[PDB]
Amino acid sequence: ETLPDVQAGSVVLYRKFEVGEVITVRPRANAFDIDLHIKPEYRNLLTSNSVFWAEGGAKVQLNGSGLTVQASPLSRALKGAISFDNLSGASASQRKGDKRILYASETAARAVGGQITLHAFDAGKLAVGMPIRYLGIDIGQIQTLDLITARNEVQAKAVLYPEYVQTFARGGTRFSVVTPQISAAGVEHLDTILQPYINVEPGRGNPRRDFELQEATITDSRYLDGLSIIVEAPEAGSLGIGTPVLFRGLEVGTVTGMTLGTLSDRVMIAMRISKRYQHLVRNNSVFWLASGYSLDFGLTGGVVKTGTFNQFIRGGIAFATPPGTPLAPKAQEGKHFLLQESEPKEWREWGTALPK
Amino acid sequence: ETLPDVQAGSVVLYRKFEVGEVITVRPRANAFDIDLHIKPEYRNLLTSNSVFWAEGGAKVQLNGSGLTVQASPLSRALKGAISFDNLSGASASQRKGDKRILYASETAARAVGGQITLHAFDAGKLAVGMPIRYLGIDIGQIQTLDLITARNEVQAKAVLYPEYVQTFARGGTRFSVVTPQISAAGVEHLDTILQPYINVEPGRGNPRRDFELQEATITDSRYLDGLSIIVEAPEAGSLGIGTPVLFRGLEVGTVTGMTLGTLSDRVMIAMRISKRYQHLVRNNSVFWLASGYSLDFGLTGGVVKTGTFNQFIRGGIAFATPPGTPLAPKAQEGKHFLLQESEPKEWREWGTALPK
């Protein structure tokens, strides 16, 4: 439909190596036609599962560290060239249209079946070419941004590479942007300042391939595949997303999210505890809010303490198990706990034996 | 009228592809004339709704990430070239003038009907080429800046792309710049430091196409299409634009603006509450000011708390609903509330059942 780069007389590439030749840009009223010459032995090597992608001009290929340019003839440097390669499931590209379609780049030539669609309310963080990462590994990329004013949202259509298209996009898949934060909570992300990406949690179910871009989550990356615990509290307090959960001062997990209840009388606080520390919680495991500095004034003599701990900056939930010679069973995947407003004196003196 | 780029002998482009040739720069005393050659089949393809835009020299096309240059002949690299394309409603460009007019760039060639005019008091943030964005999507651009000293203001004439010219500029459309902030309130905008833009709220009414650039608003972007609530207070206090409104500690909305009353005895504070949290407020929903740290000294023993919460930095309004077995109806689009100077003791013990 469009040929911005294509110039007549340019060279055909294969694995960034020259075999073949572009000869003709034959125009039509609705959709322009391009004609290519390749050798008779290699046209027998040509497959019906072949994709053609074009690139034009000279890219300096900056990319931070290395901006080298490859061994290039004057035929790319003067005229917009075309490369090609085979792949496994490219038969659908020949099912559609009358003839093969020339994709605008190598990324769009891999966009057969792996093309998904997101729905975001604010595209202020999104960008064209923004990579979708899983565990810091590039597994996808946004290629366009469509604004709709009929329903006031932005449809972001992205791609997934064909190795990960089956494992991901299975429904219940949470797409979340990462972003620089400057607030009451300290910043943990520095590469996102220069180059932001999208973290993703996989799911299980039906291949939906229609998604909603969720909010910026912090808990999910470091504390993953853990026991989900819901605790109901009268007040929010200094709690937030990223607030650590502490066991004898050791950070075992963090708060996933905060939501109003089904009845608006208690806020529910979702947390996850790590797998190695999952066994610590029991059905008798009382929570208490440990936020900020708590110190007791003294009349005869005044003892004061400034720990400069993390709970002052983000106010954490701390717990311990009361001693019982019959042990209560483990906490369920869904179970509600009652937070204690005061820190119980006894927890220093409990000494609860938790094996393994 | 002006031809800075045009050079005789240059090439005619179409979709960044060469067909045709510029032959003559024929001068006149008042307005210079340019003559173009195109092929006989393509001049039949030429339409009365065609726009011509010219670009000269070689642009490195830096643009942050990619600074590649396209496949270009020496005819652009030596001489200022001319491209063209059709569009739908370009008949007005041929109604004006004797012959077709050559626009200075591709953006000015799309500026037919979509050209609006702003009135700003200070053009210290504005710039030529500054994009007008809606939900982070580029939907417009400032192209010139005109200073008037008869009335001491700056007229900024901008463009809108023809897809969004009908949906936007409908009257009641609020144009507001975004800007880096370094003040008592924490900074949320980091891309604006490098590249500032203009956020816009659409409106409903008559196609005015004459606007006033409003002040830098913070509430509008994140908290949008919500229930507007006016609260009158004796004092301003630590309130400001961006100050959150809290329900049981959860941020449900923010303060839109602050204005003196019709009678200067009470300041009015405009806020919006989000759609999912809109049902929480009722006709009996008392406000109170929760700003800074409030702690009670103890004579026998002194309890102190430092939450390190957001309300210390920007002093928020918190509320809860008193319990009533007949429920009062929802808050109106315009209704005045009375802020309580002291936090009522009872709100912890209210336990008001708010469904859905």
Swiss-Prot record, chains A, B:
GO CC field: outer membrane-bounded periplasmic space; plasma membrane
Effect listed in the UniProt record for changing residue 313 to N: Loss of activity
Signal peptide region: none
Keywords annotated in UniProt: Cell inner membrane, Cell membrane, Lipid transport, Membrane, Repeat, Transmembrane, Transmembrane helix, Transport
Chain spans, region MCE/MlaD 7: 225-341
Gene Ontology MF term list: identical protein binding
Region described as MCE/MlaD 6: 113-216
Keyword Cell inner membrane: yes
Effect noted on mutating residue 77 to N: Loss of activity
Gene Ontology biological process terms in this record: intermembrane lipid transfer; membrane organization
Superkingdom of source: Bacteria
Entry's induction text: Induced by a defect in lipopolysaccharide molecules.
Effect of substituting residue 309 to N: Loss of activity
Chain positions covered by the region annotation MCE/MlaD 5: 1-104
Entry remark concerning the domains of this protein: The seven MCE (Mammalian Cell Entry) domains of a single protomer of LetB resemble seven beads on a string. Six copies of this linearly configured protomer associate laterally to form a homohexameric assembly. The LetB hexamers form an elongated tube consisting of seven stacked MCE rings, each formed from the association of six identical MCE domains, with a central tunnel. Rings 1, 5, 6 and 7 are dynamic and adopt open and closed states.
Family indicated by similarity: Belongs to the PqiB family.
Subunit structure: Homohexamer. May interact with LetA in the inner membrane. May also interact with partners in the outer membrane.
Name of the protein in question: Lipophilic envelope-spanning tunnel protein B
Provenance organism: Escherichia coli (strain K12)
